[PDB]
Design an enzyme around this catalytic site. Structure first.
Site, PDB file in Angstrom:
ATOM      1  N   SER A 176       0.841  -1.194   0.000  1.00  0.00           N
ATOM      2  CA  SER A 176       0.000   0.000   0.000  1.00  0.00           C
ATOM      3  C   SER A 176       0.893   1.268   0.000  1.00  0.00           C
ATOM      4  CB  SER A 176      -0.930  -0.108   1.223  1.00  0.00           C
ATOM      5  OG  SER A 176      -1.867   0.946   1.301  1.00  0.00           O
ATOM      6  N   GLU A 196      -9.433  -5.130  -2.883  1.00  0.00           N
ATOM      7  CA  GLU A 196      -8.722  -4.008  -2.305  1.00  0.00           C
ATOM      8  C   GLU A 196      -9.638  -2.951  -1.662  1.00  0.00           C
ATOM      9  OE1 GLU A 196      -5.584  -3.846  -1.980  1.00  0.00           O
ATOM     10  OE2 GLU A 196      -4.581  -4.925  -3.591  1.00  0.00           O
ATOM     11  N   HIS A 202      -7.626  -5.869   1.561  1.00  0.00           N
ATOM     12  CA  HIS A 202      -6.439  -5.047   1.398  1.00  0.00           C
ATOM     13  C   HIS A 202      -5.522  -5.351   2.583  1.00  0.00           C
ATOM     14  CE1 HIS A 202      -4.209  -1.462   0.227  1.00  0.00           C
ATOM     15  NE2 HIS A 202      -4.338  -0.949   1.439  1.00  0.00           N
TER      16      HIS A 202
END
Ligand SMILES: *[C@@H]1O[C@H](CO)[C@@H](O)[C@H](O)[C@H]1NC(C)=O
Ligand SMILES: *[C@@H]1O[C@H](CO)[C@@H](O)[C@H](O)[C@H]1NC(C)=O
Ligand SMILES: *[C@@H]1O[C@H](CO)[C@@H](O)[C@H](O)[C@H]1NC(C)=O
Ligand SMILES: *[C@@H]1O[C@H](CO)[C@@H](O)[C@H](O)[C@H]1NC(C)=O
Lengths: 532, 532
Positions: free
Chosen positions: B197, B324, B437
């Site tokens: 990320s 995600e 995610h």
């Protein structure tokens, strides 16, 4: 005599014609308007002055002056659509097929031919009304109307070429039917107008126009609706094209009077020869002289009429074919040919969408392209071809029709929707074209019942079933037999939006005909083009 | 002594730690920068002044000051991400896990944590490097960096709070590794930076930035890329947010000096308490203080750097998870809850897309909606939920990453792409969130090898295989074993664009990861927003 009928315009003499080893009467070439010739060209039609004596109605009338397809000389696929009679400006006649013995008061069906408003004939073989009149015992009428500049040159403000005269031709014929069909055994209170393509759009235009609404009871629209992108133009665009027609003929352009007078001295073929030079864009599925939103025939824009319910409230039955666009890509898009599979490269695809949505800016062209491209297999020639086929079909016929049906259904008294997807087994056009624009007509008119034509038995069964849907709907406002055992064609409602397929397989009911694509063509793209 | 290492900054003393019934060394809390406290807040970091004596590196350092998730008190799903150490501005330390016996010159992997640039810790349980160091015999380093305003407040022009200092923190740690990892048995010439990320975007930012390129050999990006819409802001937007932060704290706004001085007198929690009030839109997946395109760390816009090949040319391995977006919808979109299936109505769907594409005008919002709505079943609550999940995921992570990979591959020396879609069997988050995610991290770090954690045997096998892909790639620039018999993870090329799934089932190679949706997010929508 069964072949002699006395009408309010004078006496008429028909002819007995054989049909599926039986016979019925046919009254062909009945005049319903004064010949729109000379100083009357571009003018509103005039009622046919009554005649003394007996009008010989044993043979087909002339066809109106029109462009003639010569793309495939000798090829029946294209020539079956061409005039099969001598052309002439003296062409306002109608044809009637009457069951024998003559009915007293039966359902009447009036056919309005298509042809993009620039062509068409009531005398084509696919329009022979004897099979339908005979098989369903209805009085079948086919009218005619001026096309091309002769029927639609529009110089708003002028009374000499007001525009829409071709629609008024249709209206006059509907007036004559309303006034005289009783003498042929038809019920003037139960007439259904039906037509295909421009004919289907005309039907919808008569539903909208206050001046035509009282002349018929129900309507059937095949692959055409009034709001189609090619079916009408503003008075400004109409004027611009008439002037440009004049410029192509070296006309004096100082005034409408000068232009109109100049155009009236030209021979028919002179106007037809330069007709296509007036289109504003390099395009496909766009025709030069079409109806104009004039404030008269159409009180306001079609969309506001549809939104306010300003139209005749009755039952309607309408639908489309699976591959409405193939015809137009074959004739005008690069990469398509009659004798090849016509696999399309990205380059030709891009050229095709540009041709298909002539009025779109680059962003619009991109939205279309994205909407119809499988980006996981973008160089697939079959997908590009079929995608282009869908774009033309969706934009020009299906989505405009779906928008009309959804708007009509909110105020109407009954809607029946179909999706015709059977490719005739004896089609002479290549396979890639699929279920072609205009090829449901032969099933509506019953040609598959004629052995020599070479259709399968299931194709005869399909044609019989379609003819019975059309005629039963014309008689009652419902294509279904009251207490029949056959599967029911459900009513299309605002809520469930049901429709049926029309093919040789067992009826199958579906919902929301091409919604995904039509939300794009009816809601998103227009919003995109207006904002950008 | 195996636990004693002499570095250029002074001596360090590690601790022996058990791991899968064996042991390795761990040097925790090694300082690599002067504490960024007092007048140094917002300032570029300074190199750690060398120390005499032995630095005790047996315990984890403090975590940087950051917002703390309290949405689900006591819930491990969210608290496993929170700081598990006391927070402090004195937080610039790194951790090293070294195989035992100490290698002489092995592959080094430096982990950069994610957390949207506003949170994150190197000390979380999912980041425990012992399993990877031990299992793959690599020297594993995890660095730390300032987040929130402390790491990214940006007043371009000022040297007191220039912006990007959090990225410079990472760079300094990479400098320390380059300068000292040899003493721990690591090869400074073979270090791979990897992160998830914001950590993945940081990795990409170090690939772009001329000043960071020489400090590492290869890179791994997990669910993040430098060009993500939430990963950076212009200097104007950065300034506007810093000023607005000041306004929230009743600061004097007459000059950068006045603002900066005022912000420096405030306690950490005061800045954290109003941090979220500076976002320009009501949005989801947008964070207040992130990297700024300053003309220094980033010479020009990221897009032009990507287009001109202005970045480090090497091998990269990167990918994304299947769902995600679910995390961000759960926390900020109406209709989503942790304990329900979260079926979404059209109203909440519409609210959701507005929240998901904050920068879009109405036409843009419509294009998104059309692109993700099944108009044949628009009131389907599951489709609306999953569609929103895809919108957030595609816009924020997947499509930006696909754009980066396609641009990088044109100039790079090797790209390996994955699509991680295995939902862990012991996930505490609800089912509707899918493959969340950040949940591939536990497999990258090898937690499934710890019996007590309760993963299946196939999940251990998957984790072992992923760890071996990551480490083999770090060592050689290719995740595949030279002459192995296992199925080969193919190279991603501009032409074929291949990628693999990462799950417990037999490897399966695919092509063009989400092209349809990414052509929309990367080509069409931006063009639409620029034109309108
Ligand atoms: C009707 O006119 C057509 C014109 O060619 C002719 O063929 C036909 O024999 C005529 N019939 C009568 C009864 O006049
Ligand atoms: C049509 O109108 C009649 C009478 O006004 C009404 O009874 C009937 O429900 C209507 N049918 C539809 C489908 O609207
Ligand atoms: C290192 O410092 C930590 C701080 O709490 C302590 O727990 C540990 O025992 C110390 N070890 C040595 C050798 O000083
Ligand atoms: C990487 O670079 C080397 C040497 O420059 C070259 O031989 C090799 O083909 C390159 N590999 C790729 C995938 O570009």
């Amino acid at each position: 005599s069964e072949l002699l009928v006395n009408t309010k315009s004078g006496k008429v003499m028909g002819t007995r014609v054989p049909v599926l080893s039986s016979h019925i009467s046919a009254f062909l070439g009945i005049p319903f308007a004064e010949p729109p010739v000379g100083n009357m060209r571009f003018r509103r039609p005039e009622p046919k002055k009554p005649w003394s004596g007996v009008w010989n109605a044993s043979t087909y009338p002339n066809n109106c002056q029109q462009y003639v397809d010569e793309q495939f000389p000798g090829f029946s696929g294209s020539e079956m659509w061409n005039p099969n009679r001598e052309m002439s400006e003296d062409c306002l006649y109608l044809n009637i097929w009457v069951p024998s013995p003559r009915p007293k008061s039966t359902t009447v069906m009036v056919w309005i031919y298509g042809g993009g408003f620039y062509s068409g004939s009531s005398t084509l073989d696919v329009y022979n009304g004897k099979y339908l009149a005979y098989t369903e015992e209805v009085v079948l009428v086919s009218l005619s109307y001026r096309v091309g500049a002769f029927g639609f040159l529009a110089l708003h403000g002028s009374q000499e070429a007001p525009g829409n005269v071709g629609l008024l031709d249709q209206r006059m014929a509907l007036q004559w039917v309303h006034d005289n069909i009783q003498f042929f055994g038809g019920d003037p209170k139960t007439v259904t107008i039906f037509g295909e393509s421009a004919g289907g759009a005309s039907v919808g235009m008569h539903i909208l126009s206050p001046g035509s609404r009282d002349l018929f009871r129900r309507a059937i629209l095949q692959s055409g609706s009034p709001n189609c992108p090619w079916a009408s133009v503003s008075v400004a665009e109409g004027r611009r094209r008439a002037v440009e027609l004049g410029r192509n003929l070296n006309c004096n352009l100082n005034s409408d009077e000068e232009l109109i007078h100049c155009l009236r001295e030209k021979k028919p073929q002179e106007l037809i020869d330069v007709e296509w030079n007036v289109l504003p864009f390099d395009s496909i599925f766009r025709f030069s002289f079409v109806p104009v939103i004039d404030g008269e025939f159409f009180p306001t824009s079609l969309e506001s009429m549809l939104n306010s319910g300003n139209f005749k409230k009755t039952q309607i039955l309408l639908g489309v074919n699976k591959d409405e666009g193939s015809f137009f890509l074959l004739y005008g898009a690069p990469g398509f040919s009659k004798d090849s599979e016509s696999k399309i490269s990205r380059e030709d695809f891009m050229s095709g969408v540009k041709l298909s949505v002539p009025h779109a800016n680059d962003l619009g062209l991109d939205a279309v392209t994205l909407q119809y491209t499988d980006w996981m297999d973008d160089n697939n020639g079959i997908k590009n071809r079929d995608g282009l086929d869908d774009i033309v079909g969706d934009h020009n016929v299906i989505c405009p029709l779906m928008h009309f049906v959804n708007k009509y259904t909110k105020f109407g008294n009954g809607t029946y929707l179909y999706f015709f997807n059977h490719r005739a087994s004896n089609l002479v056009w290549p396979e890639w074209m699929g279920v072609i624009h205009g090829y449901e007509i032969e099933f509506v008119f019953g040609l598959p019942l004629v052995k020599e034509l070479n259709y399968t038995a299931e194709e005869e069964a399909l044609s019989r079933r379609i003819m019975h849907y059309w005629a039963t709907f014309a008689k009652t406002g419902n294509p279904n037999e009251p207490h029949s055992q056959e599967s029911k064609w459900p009513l299309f409602t605002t809520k469930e939006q049901k429709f049926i397929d029309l093919n040789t397989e067992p009826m199958k009911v579906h919902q929301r005909l091409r919604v995904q694509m039509c939300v794009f063509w009816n809601q998103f793209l227009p919003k995109l083009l207006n904002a950008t």
